[PDB]
Design an enzyme around this catalytic site. Structure first.
Site, PDB file in Angstrom:
ATOM      1  N   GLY A 212      -6.539   3.174  10.079  1.00 31.72           N
ATOM      2  CA  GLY A 212      -6.757   2.190   9.068  1.00 31.72           C
ATOM      3  C   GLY A 212      -6.120   2.517   7.718  1.00 31.72           C
ATOM      4  O   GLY A 212      -6.042   1.642   6.849  1.00 31.72           O
TER       5      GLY A 212
ATOM      6  N   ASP B 164       9.211   4.320  10.973  1.00 26.05           N
ATOM      7  CA  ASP B 164       7.922   3.618  10.936  1.00 26.05           C
ATOM      8  C   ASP B 164       7.738   2.937   9.562  1.00 26.05           C
ATOM      9  O   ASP B 164       7.025   3.418   8.668  1.00 26.05           O
ATOM     10  CB  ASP B 164       6.772   4.543  11.244  1.00 26.05           C
ATOM     11  CG  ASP B 164       5.489   3.785  11.599  1.00 26.05           C
ATOM     12  OD1 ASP B 164       4.452   4.483  11.773  1.00 26.05           O
ATOM     13  OD2 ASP B 164       5.515   2.547  11.663  1.00 26.05           O
TER      14      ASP B 164
ATOM     15  N   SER C 151      -2.922   3.792   7.847  1.00 23.88           N
ATOM     16  CA  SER C 151      -1.506   3.598   8.166  1.00 23.88           C
ATOM     17  C   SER C 151      -0.936   2.496   7.334  1.00 23.88           C
ATOM     18  O   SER C 151      -1.577   1.471   7.094  1.00 23.88           O
ATOM     19  CB  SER C 151      -1.293   3.282   9.620  1.00 23.88           C
ATOM     20  OG  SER C 151      -1.598   4.408  10.426  1.00 23.88           O
ATOM     21  N   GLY C 152       0.319   2.689   6.944  1.00 22.82           N
ATOM     22  CA  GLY C 152       1.028   1.698   6.169  1.00 22.82           C
ATOM     23  C   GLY C 152       0.853   1.849   4.678  1.00 22.82           C
ATOM     24  O   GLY C 152       1.669   1.322   3.917  1.00 22.82           O
TER      25      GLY C 152
ATOM     26  N   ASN D 191     -13.374  -3.328  -2.757  1.00 18.91           N
ATOM     27  CA  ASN D 191     -14.432  -3.259  -1.771  1.00 18.91           C
ATOM     28  C   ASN D 191     -14.148  -4.310  -0.709  1.00 18.91           C
ATOM     29  O   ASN D 191     -14.161  -5.489  -1.016  1.00 18.91           O
ATOM     30  CB  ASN D 191     -15.775  -3.505  -2.445  1.00 18.91           C
ATOM     31  CG  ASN D 191     -16.923  -3.204  -1.524  1.00 18.91           C
ATOM     32  OD1 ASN D 191     -16.919  -3.572  -0.358  1.00 18.91           O
ATOM     33  ND2 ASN D 191     -17.915  -2.550  -2.039  1.00 18.91           N
TER      34      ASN D 191
ATOM     35  N   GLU E 152      -7.720  -5.623  -4.301  1.00 21.54           N
ATOM     36  CA  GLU E 152      -8.859  -5.350  -3.467  1.00 21.54           C
ATOM     37  C   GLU E 152      -9.439  -3.983  -3.811  1.00 21.54           C
ATOM     38  O   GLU E 152      -8.689  -3.028  -4.020  1.00 21.54           O
ATOM     39  CB  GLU E 152      -8.455  -5.404  -1.986  1.00 21.54           C
ATOM     40  CG  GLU E 152      -9.531  -5.207  -0.942  1.00 21.54           C
ATOM     41  CD  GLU E 152     -10.537  -6.286  -0.971  1.00 21.54           C
ATOM     42  OE1 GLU E 152     -10.559  -7.076  -0.011  1.00 21.54           O
ATOM     43  OE2 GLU E 152     -11.317  -6.312  -1.950  1.00 21.54           O
TER      44      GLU E 152
ATOM     45  N   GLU F  54      -9.385 -10.098  -6.472  1.00 18.74           N
ATOM     46  CA  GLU F  54      -8.541 -10.207  -5.291  1.00 18.74           C
ATOM     47  C   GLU F  54      -7.622 -11.423  -5.378  1.00 18.74           C
ATOM     48  O   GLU F  54      -8.012 -12.470  -5.869  1.00 18.74           O
ATOM     49  CB  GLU F  54      -9.415 -10.337  -4.038  1.00 18.74           C
ATOM     50  CG  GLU F  54     -10.413  -9.222  -3.806  1.00 18.74           C
ATOM     51  CD  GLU F  54     -11.807  -9.510  -4.342  1.00 18.74           C
ATOM     52  OE1 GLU F  54     -11.949 -10.190  -5.386  1.00 18.74           O
ATOM     53  OE2 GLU F  54     -12.797  -9.048  -3.716  1.00 18.74           O
TER      54      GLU F  54
ATOM     55  N   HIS G 292       4.364   0.177  12.768  1.00 16.97           N
ATOM     56  CA  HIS G 292       3.388   0.133  13.841  1.00 16.97           C
ATOM     57  C   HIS G 292       2.207  -0.733  13.502  1.00 16.97           C
ATOM     58  O   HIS G 292       1.503  -1.217  14.392  1.00 16.97           O
ATOM     59  CB  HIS G 292       2.983   1.551  14.279  1.00 16.97           C
ATOM     60  CG  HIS G 292       1.918   2.200  13.454  1.00 16.97           C
ATOM     61  ND1 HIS G 292       2.151   3.224  12.560  1.00 16.97           N
ATOM     62  CD2 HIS G 292       0.590   1.984  13.445  1.00 16.97           C
ATOM     63  CE1 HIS G 292       1.003   3.620  12.034  1.00 16.97           C
ATOM     64  NE2 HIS G 292       0.042   2.872  12.555  1.00 16.97           N
TER      65      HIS G 292
HETATM   66 NA    NA Z   1     -13.431  -7.244  -2.340  1.00 16.91          NA
END
Ligand code: NA
Length: 240
Positions: free
Chosen positions: A186, A93, A188-189, A61, A59, A69, A45
């Site tokens: 946010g 899903d 999700s996944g 922040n 990642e 990153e 989704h």
């Molecule tokens: Na960052």
């Protein structure tokens, strides 16, 4: 994540941020799990919309330079062929994202280990959800990666009438439901990490929460059960 704590920046090195291009910027939309140097596992989704996606590994922040990153474009999206966007309760899903480049591994960027096929967690098994999702129902995204301790709720309990009833399937994992801690929009996944024989493995892909709110008692966060999709995942990677 509602009711979370800030994660240490090297605790969950397989967590990724899935972002879409928004004007001259990028916006976090979902989590994911790095499963090969060039493949991410996420929720179907999350990639329903016709957007330009990138993945960020290393990642911590979303709003500050961490110095760790790596930013990579999504080259191919393979959604589970049984997924139906207007029926999340049916399951399926899950999606795999092939990255445009292979990322470099380090203490901040590692592959998620997946459970053996068919593994089902005992009720009340120890797990953590991680993500940058909302920190309150109808709130805002976290800046820093959050974790929350969400014990599993087995199928028999989760599919009972005061929990999720028919909506939860055996192809899902439920965790949490205490009314304080949960996944939220946010997240999700992203992963549900569960400690088994001394080793964390990613047993869930965050899929849904209640329409009544994120942290709702007896509405545990619901995840796609990774161990139901091992063959699918391997088949996709082998054929792409
Ligand atoms: Na960052």
């Amino acid at each position: 994540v509602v009711g979370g704590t800030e994660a240490q920046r090297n605790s969950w090195p397989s967590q990724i941020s899935l972002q879409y291009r928004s004007g001259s910027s990028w916006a976090h939309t979902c989590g994911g799990t790095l499963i090969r140097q060039n493949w991410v596992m996420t929720a179907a989704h999350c990639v329903d919309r016709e957007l330009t996606f990138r993945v960020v590994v290393g990642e911590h922040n979303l709003n500050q330079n961490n110095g760790t990153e790596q930013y990579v474009g999504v080259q191919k999206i393979v959604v589970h062929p049984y997924w139906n966007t207007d029926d999340v309760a049916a399951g399926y899903d899950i999606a795999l994202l092939r990255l445009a480049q292979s990322v470099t591994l380090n203490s901040y960027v590692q592959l998620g280990v997946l459970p053996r096929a068919g593994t089902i967690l005992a009720n009340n098994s120890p797990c953590y959800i991680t993500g940058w999702g909302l920190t309150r129902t109808n709130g805002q995204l976290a800046q820093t990666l959050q974790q929350a301790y969400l014990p599993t709720v087995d199928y028999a309990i989760c599919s009972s009438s005061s929990y999720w009833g028919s909506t939860v399937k055996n192809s899902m994992v439920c965790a949490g439901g205490d009314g304080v801690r949960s996944g939220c929009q946010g997240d999700s996944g992203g992963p549900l990490h569960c400690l088994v024989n001394g080793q964390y493995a990613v047993h869930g892909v965050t899929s849904f929460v209640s329409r009544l709110g994120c942290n709702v008692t007896r509405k545990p966060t619901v995840f796609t059960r990774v161990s139901a999709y091992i063959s699918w995942i391997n088949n996709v990677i082998a054929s792409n």
